[PDB]
Ligand binder design. Sequence first.
Ligand code: NA
Ligand code: ZN
Length: 225
Amino acid sequence: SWRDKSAKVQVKESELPSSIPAQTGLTFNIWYNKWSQGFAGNTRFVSPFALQPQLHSGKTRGDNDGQLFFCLFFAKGMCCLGPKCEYLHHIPDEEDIGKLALRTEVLDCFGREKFADYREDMGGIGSFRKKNKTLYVGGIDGALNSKHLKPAQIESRIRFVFSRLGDIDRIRYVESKNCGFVKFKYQANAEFAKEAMSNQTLLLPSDKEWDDRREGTGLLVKWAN
Ligand code: NA
Ligand SMILES: [Zn+2]
């Protein structure tokens, strides 16, 4: 269990761009976009950083301070703080989901304002965004490095990878569209998995293609419409 462990340092401060910002505001986006734009090319880069749920998860300062929000850097495999982090470094489970559902309505599992293209009538947040638990997952073939897997094996692969970030409700893979849909049982996991799987490979250390995973293209993960 993560509860008996201290969160591991994922990266050294020096492996990251200078001026590491807070995770809650739009400065994170500016910072992350600048980093994202340093990867040359028209196509989505495969991130050099990845969350390893079993290896990385553990207690942080947040667990002692009664923090409810998870670390955005942790989700992306980009946290240098480890046990020093004020935010949670584990996969959101029932306890966390329960706590979050009582504390806030307007903020996601990372403590960022939930964004919708529209607001409700006086005037919370967009109703569809509010209840959405389903992620659009695009560019599957690129994230596998064009590894030849059958549609059913691709479903199994997506299920296996996303299942490590929360309980799965439903998986659909559409071959003709090179895309899938991952519905989580809980929104918090969908929010977490969205940030965790952006620009990620679908390959596993068990594949012979694993070492060449950055030759492919990173996953596109968005909310489904
Ligand atoms: Na800010
Ligand atoms: Zn952290």
